[PDB]
């Protein structure tokens, strides 16, 4: 730690000691049903973008690796998460929105985008934490005579707020002359239809879009991943996986006053202090494993190679594993130097009126004194 081969007399702070974890536990709820992504992904027909569907996926285990066998897309477009880590973490509610758009407008299914689809048809929030899946469909959504079952909205008095629908079909009035049903030169019906034909370019093909919106942990968790659970162990340094929250620490029974709706506890530095087990409803404190600071008291390298080691801030009935003499000091206990009843001037300072030195006894050794 000094980047040198010779060490002068003094006390040096080298590193910190840590109690390494021994076991690993995983705690997931008791959920056995399978999520119906299949019912979402192949259907006889989808809906228009102004009347987009929404399916609630809840109380099931979700496998996201069977998505690739249902539709011939290229890759996920995930915001906030990554598609390869979707099996290692658990949500509370997953929604699925299904609609068909043109290939020009797939780029408007991103957060923070404006245009025509993202203004009057389907608007995403800027805090989006989901994945957008879009694939070409020219063999099911197009006809040689023209497929006119898909509609979209051009005219609307205001912009759509995120995650809301407008299935109203009323005649727009952009002019100053009221019509109330007459589609004149100033009143138009704001639902035009795509003229989908198979003999188009690649930018005008229909594209089936499925948008998965994830809801993070603010509740008891319902839509988890396919991972087995482990028996709960307490009073030991382990690794825990409580509902996708990963950390290292010890677990103790708590005497806290958690309300029924609350599930987590947080500290001043916004780290998790207490957690509620998902299988049995009990509260467990999360205390980090035992640590501290290690200081090395040595004389010069030219003098000798004897070393005393000080563990800062602990009473050492708590060291997991230098010399064999143990002396307790207010600055943590000192191992490797015996305590003599004399008193000399301070050679190497330790703290709280205790110093150390390399002196004889009658056979040279490191001694500690006041």
């Amino acid at each position: 730690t000094l980047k040198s081969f010779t060490v002068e007399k003094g006390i040096y702070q080298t590193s910190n000691f840590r109690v390494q974890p021994t076991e690993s536990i995983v705690r997931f709820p008791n959920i056995t049903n399978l999520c119906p992504f299949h019912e979402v992904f192949n259907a006889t027909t989808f809906a228009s973008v102004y009347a987009w569907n929404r399916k609630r996926i809840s109380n099931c285990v979700a496998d996201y690796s069977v998505i690739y066998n249902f539709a011939p897309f290229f890759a996920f477009k995930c915001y906030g998460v990554s598609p390869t880590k979707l099996n290692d973490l658990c949500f509370t509610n997953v929604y699925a929105d299904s609609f068909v758009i043109r290939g020009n407008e797939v780029s408007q299914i991103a957060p923070g985008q404006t245009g025509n689809i993202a203004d009057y048809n389907y608007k995403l929030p800027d805090d989006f934490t989901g994945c957008v899946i879009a694939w070409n469909s020219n063999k099911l959504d197009s006809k040689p005579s023209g497929n006119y079952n898909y509609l979209y909205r051009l005219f609307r008095k205001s912009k759509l707020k995120p995650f809301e629908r407008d299935i109203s079909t009323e005649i727009y009035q952009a002019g100053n002359r009221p019509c109330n049903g007459v589609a004149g030169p100033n009143c138009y019906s704001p639902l035009q239809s795509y003229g989908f034909r198979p003999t188009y370019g690649v930018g005008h093909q229909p594209y089936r879009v499925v948008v998965l919106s994830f809801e993070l942990l603010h509740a008891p968790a319902t839509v988890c991943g396919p991972k087995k659970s482990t028996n709960l162990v307490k009073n030991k340094c382990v690794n825990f996986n409580f509902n996708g929250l990963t950390g290292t620490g010890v677990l103790t029974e708590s005497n806290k006053k958690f309300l029924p709706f609350q599930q987590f506890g947080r500290d001043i530095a916004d780290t998790t202090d207490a957690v509620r087990d998902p299988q049995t409803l009990e509260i467990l404190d999360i205390t980090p494993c035992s640590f501290g600071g290690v200081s090395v008291i040595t004389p010069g390298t030219n003098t000798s190679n004897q070393v005393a080691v000080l563990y800062q801030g602990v009473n050492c009935t708590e060291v997991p594993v230098t010399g064999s003499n143990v002396f307790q000091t207010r600055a943590g206990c000192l191992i490797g130097a015996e305590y003599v009843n004399n008193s000399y001037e301070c050679d190497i300072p330790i703290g709280a009126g205790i110093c150390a030195s390399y002196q004889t006894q009658t056979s040279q050794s490191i001694i500690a004194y006041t």
Binding site: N16, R18, S82, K85, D285, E318, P349
Partner: protein, 346 residues
């Protein structure tokens, strides 16, 4: 605001004013000497036993050795400050059991063996007025590891690598140094600040002090009872002033509060996101792949390093100010306790 009361000296070129009586007065000056010695671990603060953050922090640079060197230099500097101010006598003197120092009491500044810590009554008041926080290793890693229904800031800063080192000299040794200085000053005068201690009766020493300030020594010997009573009443007045008013020690209390709020701000800066998707490394490493979590962890590493460097720079400036005050206190102990000073208002 009012600058002061209006006055006009009745000046004339054949008129003088000469006092006919005096007043012995005891004042009080409070000077900071040292401050809290802190020790900061980088890996527990910035990363907190995450292997990926530790690898990126090793890949980042070598700023943490510089921060550790600066904080170690500050701690050794405060130990040097306390040793410079208090350790000025080579022998621990002792007072005689008879306490008749010419009618002067000296009973509230000399130690008494009733308390386990041999401190005087005014020293007990001065240690009672300052509400000390982070006094050293008082938690000792046993209360933090247990279950407390209301966690304090000390455990939250201990779990993030922010510790407090104890001072080298305990308060018993500081009280012993001040007791030795008081015994040498009472029984010797200024002769123990030059060579060996020379005993002298306290009345004759006080006559030497009056000869020092420019007054003939017959004034003291003909008014010894009045001077002793005035000194006792001044000691009683500063007794009642230290007992009643709690705003006198607002320099030392400000030092303690400054160190506490600096450590509290350093703890509270861990909850900031610094542009990343979350402020915790575990959710970033669990919700993302390697490539994107590298960018988010890099943003958090840069933010926490900037916060730690800001803390270290402010600590360096505060240590320079405290060292200047400690040099002033050492000069005052050398020139006013070990002798008589002719400097005006020093």
């Amino acid at each position: 605001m009012s600058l002061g009361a209006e006055n006009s000296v009745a000046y004339s070129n054949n008129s003088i004013a000469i006092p006919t009586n005096f007043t012995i007065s005891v004042t009080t000056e409070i000077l900071p000497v040292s401050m809290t010695k802190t020790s900061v671990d980088c890996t527990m603060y910035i990363c907190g036993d995450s292997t990926e953050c530790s690898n990126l922090l090793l890949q980042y640079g070598s700023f943490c050795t510089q921060l550790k060197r600066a904080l170690t230099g500050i701690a050794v500097e405060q130990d040097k400050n306390t040793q410079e101010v208090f350790a000025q006598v080579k022998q621990i003197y002792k007072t005689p059991p008879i306490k008749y120092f010419g009618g002067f009491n000296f009973s509230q500044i000399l130690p008494d063996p009733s308390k386990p810590s041999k401190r005087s009554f005014i020293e007990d008041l001065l240690f009672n007025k300052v509400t000390l926080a982070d006094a050293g290793f008082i938690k000792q890693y046993g209360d933090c590891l247990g279950d407390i229904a209301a966690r304090d800031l000390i455990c939250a800063q201990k779990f993030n690598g922010l510790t407090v080192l104890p001072p080298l000299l305990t308060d018993e040794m500081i009280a012993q140094y001040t007791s030795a200085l008081l015994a040498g000053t009472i029984t010797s005068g200024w002769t123990f600040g030059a060579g060996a201690a020379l005993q002298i009766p306290f009345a004759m020493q006080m006559a030497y002090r009056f000869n020092g300030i420019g007054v003939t020594q017959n004034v003291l010997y003909e008014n010894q009872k009045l001077i002793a009573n005035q000194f006792n009443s001044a000691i009683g007045k500063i007794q009642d002033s230290l007992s009643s008013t709690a705003s006198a020690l607002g320099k030392l209390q400000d030092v303690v509060n400054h160190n506490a709020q600096a450590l509290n701000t350093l703890v509270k800066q861990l909850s900031s996101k610094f542009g990343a998707i979350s402020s915790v490394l575990n959710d970033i490493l669990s919700r993302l792949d390697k490539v994107e979590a590298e960018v988010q962890i890099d943003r958090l590493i840069t933010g926490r390093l900037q916060s730690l460097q800001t803390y270290v720079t402010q600590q360096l400036i505060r240590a320079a100010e405290i060292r200047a005050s400690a040099n002033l206190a050492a000069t005052k102990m050398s020139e006013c306790v070990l002798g008589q000073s002719k400097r005006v208002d020093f």
